[PDB]
Nucleic acid binder design. Structure first.
Lengths: 62, 509, 105, 95, 49, 70, 16, 59
RNA sequence: UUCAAAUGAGAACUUUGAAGACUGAAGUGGGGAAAGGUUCCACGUCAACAGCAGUUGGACGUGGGUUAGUCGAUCCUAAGA
């Protein structure tokens, strides 16, 4: 399969880059069925696609 | 298995169909024979009635077959909406007088009306149909039984329908007893033999779509042309059998009917009082395209029934389409209209404002169905007219590749890879070409009779009966050749049924 | 035939004198070699956790000793060569120093 | 866990019993087009036998170009017979 | 570009409508010499000025 | 286009290159007996002209789409 | 030549 | 098929204009089918009937 | 650069995930002018091309897509014609 379009659309929907967004590899057919931002939003809320919180840059030392 | 739960569900599904048949046959006599409703107005009223009846008794339950009213040429599929009435006019505005009944909705005299419908509960279904006939009125008579019997080929057709119906009923009744059958135990060989000789006696050929078959839960044969199945025991009479009978899957040999089983009968007879010659009886589809041809005999229409192929999936871009798909898949695997899926359709009370509400909903549903159909999720159940072809054109034909011609842009696949007559190596595409390629474009009139039965010791006939499908008295000829094996057997069968036990379910008041 | 065993492997002497940008893939290949030697099967499946354990200190900082669990198994596939295959997992422990190999239930 | 598991299991609708095993209604078209999409290559040709005839003919004629290793039916780079600059102390024209 | 003139856009539209292969129902014709489109164009191979 | 119907009560037509928004408004109003709110035009890459036509809320695009046939 | 024979027999049956 | 110029030459001006309008409506009705089906030959006949009518009018 | 799985006849090169690294705000980022012209996006999809490979592609086949009273041209004049 090929979830390139889905990763792109999920990034554009959630408002982050593709480096963040995460696709669970088990729900592959359910993700590949999606070809629309509404479906990607459904997968965002149900817990199939998540946001991957930020890589930290601490300033304790500074 | 025939449990009490199964068979009483069959009974209460059947007698709803019976009383709805009585309702329609009520209404048509109210409208025409009595001192005026159109076809599509009859249809949704009948379906409203059936669902209003279904609500009282009983999870998967509803209408298997939407009520189809064929008229005088159509083997099956005619069941339009109220959306399409002006469309039918302004499409067929330039054509000729034929198909005026189906085009306008008002029925004429001498018009052979084949009604059919069905109802299902938890997958256990019951189909029925009846060929009735319009004949003008008596005015000087006080009671006004309408004047004149029918005489011609349509009379032939009705006679063959009724006689074939009763004979196959009796045969499947003797299926219980390995006795009480004239040896002149039971097989599709015998069934096809007796029905073919009846058809030959009355000079009315069998239509390709007709069949007699087994039923199981959710698997009746409602579609029979679109969806496939491996386990299908039953008999059909198509062009392959026509050519084989002229010479001398659906296997007929390894097939002997047994106790504790439910069966569907569906017989279609196309009359031949002209035609002059030996020839084939095939089917032609009706499209909405005025522009493919110039000839006036062609009918232009849009089918109303659909069916959705639950194996496929595709996200729609359109909100209305996705909501309509919700409404569809919350219904079952049986065909449906757009009117069935709505808010006000059963018509608890009925007025013009509710019909208007339904029309607006329909205007949205057609937009949804556009995208649902452009993607291959739902398909149309086609409108088929019986059409005659003489063997001369076929034998003089030229088919530069036989057994290899697909039709390639037919959308369903199963009517595409058919090969109706493997001998002579002609396919449906070239057969359509030859049917069109001739000024002998003779379309036949057809009569239809459909019943549902079950074998326990008696034959419990869940449809039919004398209240239902009592025949319009007619005046036919070619009335059943004596002096043969099979005819002796048939008459002995008819006499012996009076004792065999045939139970029949009555309609609901 | 079907057996699981703990082992410890000295990667220092196997990666002695290896390019820094080749040290960790060489450790992967040497672990596959190790499993093939001990079990005698060519197909060897590492775990992504073992890959993480190798690549934790980057290409050029792989630990000198690692503690592995090698589990031989059947191939349930339709039909394949190598009817058995080895599956290597990591053992996360205090320190791999001072241990010897033992069979596991 | 048992509450959730008893809520989990299914009722086996009739959609399943019909169309679980089955597939390939409105089978694979060639160019992966919808019902209304205007396929130019194959609108005129109706039947699959002559469709295969045409495809085989195209594959037969593609070969001498595929031998010359073109990027398609559009690469017509035409190479000269000889270049003047390649044949020619002081200034020279190349290093 | 992106602020074209209509002349350039019209020429581009002609080029787009030309950028096709040859139909298959022309192979099947009596006395057909044509087997491919020799005036075919691609944005990367040849420029159309 | 079909989505734009239910979205904005909008029809989508192919029209002449020689035409303009006034003529398109007049033509839709003459042929289909509807009042038009605005027209928006573009020229496609294949050389034709596309026109989005927004109708007033009095008239509904679904009726006109059913009347035409598509 | 099977089509020849079956068409011959079919002509035979339809002519009478 | 289609119209006949010798038939139209007897007709009047207003009948001809009405026939032209009807032919234009029919052609438009065919052009919405032409986008769903590729082949639709009646359009040739009506499109040439329009030209015949216009020729007669200019004559 | 690596590990597993998925897809597939076939995976060093495709997809997802798990790791390790890089550009390091005078970027391997986000947008534009000239030029190009559909290369954008989707669906199928491997004969030729991508100096290995290929299930992938700016390739091949078929479609979709560019909406302005307010952004620009249009108007003004500059050197000049």
């Amino acid at each position: 399969a090929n979830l390139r379009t889905q990763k792109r659309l999920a990034a554009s929907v959630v408002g982050v880059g593709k480096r963040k967004v995460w696709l669970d590899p088990n729900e592959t057919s359910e993700i590949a069925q999606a070809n629309s931002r509404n479906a990607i939003r459904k997968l965002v809320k149900n817990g199939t696609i998540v946001k991957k919180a930020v890589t930290v840059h601490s300033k304790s030392r500074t | 298995i025939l449990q009490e739960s199964v068979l009483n569900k069959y009974r209460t599904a059947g007698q709803i169909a019976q009383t709805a048949l009585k309702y329609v046959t009520s209404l048509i006599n109210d409208s025409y024979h009595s001192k005026q409703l159109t076809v599509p107005e009859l249809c949704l009223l009948t379906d409203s009635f059936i669902l209003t009846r279904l609500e009282q008794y009983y999870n998967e339950r509803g209408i298997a077959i939407p009520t189809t009213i064929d008229i005088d040429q159509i083997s099956g599929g005619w069941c339009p909406e109220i959306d399409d009435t002006q469309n039918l006019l302004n499409w067929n505005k330039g054509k000729d007088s034929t198909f005026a009944s189906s085009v306008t909705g008002t029925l004429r005299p001498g018009d052979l009306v084949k009604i059919t419908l069905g109802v299902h509960i938890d997958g256990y279904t019951s189909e029925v149909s009846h060929t009735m006939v319009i004949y003008p009125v008596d005015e000087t008579k006080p009671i006004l039984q309408p004047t004149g019997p029918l005489l011609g080929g349509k009379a032939d057709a009705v006679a063959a329908a009724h006689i074939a119906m009763e004979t196959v009923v009796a045969l499947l009744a003797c299926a219980l007893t390995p006795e009480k059958l004239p040896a002149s135990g039971i097989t599709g060989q015998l069934i096809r033999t007796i029905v073919d000789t009846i058809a030959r006696s009355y000079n009315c050929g069998v239509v390709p779509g007709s069949r007699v078959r087994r039923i199981r839960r959710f698997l009746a044969g409602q579609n029979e042309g679109i969806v496939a199945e491996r386990e299908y025991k039953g008999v059909v009479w198509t062009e392959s059998h026509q050519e084989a009978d002229l010479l001398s899957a659906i296997p007929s040999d390894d097939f002997v009917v047994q106790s504790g089983e439910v069966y569907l009968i569906d017989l279609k007879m196309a009359s031949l009082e002209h035609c002059t010659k030996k020839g084939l009886v095939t089917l032609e589809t009706v499209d909405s395209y005025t522009g493919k041809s110039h000839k006036a005999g062609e009918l232009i229409a849009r089918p109303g029934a659909y069916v959705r192929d639950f194996a496929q999936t595709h996200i729609l871009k359109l909100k209305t389409s996705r909501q309509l798909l919700t409404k569809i898949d919350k219904q079952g695997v049986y065909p449906f209209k757009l009117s069935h899926l709505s808010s006000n359709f059963p018509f608890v009370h009925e007025n013009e404002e509710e019909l208007q509400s339904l029309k607006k909903d329909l205007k949205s549903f057609r937009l949804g169905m556009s995208e649902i159909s452009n993607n291959y999720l739902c398909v149309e159940s086609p409108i088929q007219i019986a059409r005659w072809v003489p063997w001369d054109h076929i034998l003089k034909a030229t088919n530069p590749n036989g057994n290899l011609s697909y039709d390639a842009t037919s959308t369903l696949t199963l009517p595409g890879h058919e090969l109706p007559l493997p001998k002579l190596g002609v396919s449906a595409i070239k057969l359509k070409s030859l049917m069109n390629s001739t000024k002998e474009s003779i379309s036949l009139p057809v009569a239809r009779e459909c019943n549902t039965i079950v074998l326990c010791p008696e034959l419990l006939r869940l449809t039919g009966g004398s209240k239902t499908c009592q025949p319009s008295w007619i005046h036919s000829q070619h009335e059943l050749n004596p002096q043969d094996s099979i005819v002796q057997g048939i008459f002995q069968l008819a006499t012996l049924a009076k004792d065999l036990l045939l139970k029949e379910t009555q309609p609901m008041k | 035939d079907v057996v699981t065993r703990e082992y410890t492997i000295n990667l220092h002497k196997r990666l002695h004198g290896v390019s820094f940008k080749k040290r960790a893939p060489r450790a992967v290949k040497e672990i596959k070699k190790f499993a093939k030697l001990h079990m005698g099967t060519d197909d060897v499946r590492l775990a992504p956790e073992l890959n993480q354990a190798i690549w934790k200190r980057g290409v050029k900082g792989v630990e000198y000793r690692l503690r592995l669990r090698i589990s031989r198994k059947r191939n349930e596939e339709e039909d394949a060569k190598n009817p058995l295959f080895s599956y290597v997992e990591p053992v996360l422990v205090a320190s791999a120093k001072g241990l010897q190999t033992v069979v596991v239930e | 866990q048992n509450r959730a598991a008893r809520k989990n299991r299914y009722v086996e609708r009739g959609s399943d019993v019909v169309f679980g095993d089955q597939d390939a209604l409105t089978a694979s078209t060639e160019n992966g087009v919808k019902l209304r999409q205007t396929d130019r290559l194959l609108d005129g040709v109706a039947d699959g036998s002559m469709r295969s005839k045409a495809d085989r003919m195209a594959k037969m004629e593609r070969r001498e170009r595929n031998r010359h290793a073109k990027q398609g039916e559009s690469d017509r780079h035409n190479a000269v017979s000889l270049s003047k600059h390649l044949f020619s102390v002081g200034k020279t024209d190349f290093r | 570009a992106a602020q074209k003139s209509f002349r350039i856009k019209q020429k581009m539209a002609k080029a787009k409508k030309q950028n096709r292969p040859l139909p298959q129902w022309i192979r099947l014709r009596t006395n057909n010499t044509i087997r491919y489109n020799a005036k075919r164009r691609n944005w990367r191979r040849t420029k159309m000025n | 286009a079909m989505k734009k119907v239910e979205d904005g009560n909008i029809l989508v037509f192919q029209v002449s290159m020689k035409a303009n928004k006034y003529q398109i408004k007049k033509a839709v109003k003459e042929l289909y007996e509807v009042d038009v709110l605005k027209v928006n035009t573009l020229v496609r890459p294949n050389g034709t002209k596309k026109a989005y036509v927004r109708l007033t809320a009095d008239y509904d695009a679904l009726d006109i789409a059913n009347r035409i046939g598509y | 030549s099977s089509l020849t024979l079956v068409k011959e027999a079919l002509w035979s049956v339809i002519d009478d | 098929a289609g119209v006949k110029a010798y038939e139209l030459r007897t007709k009047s001006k207003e009948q001809l204009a009405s026939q032209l309008v009807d032919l234009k409506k029919e052609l438009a009705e065919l052009k919405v089918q032409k986008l769903s089906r590729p082949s639709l030959p009646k359009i040739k006949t009506v499109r040439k009937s329009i030209a015949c009518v216009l020729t007669v009018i200019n004559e």
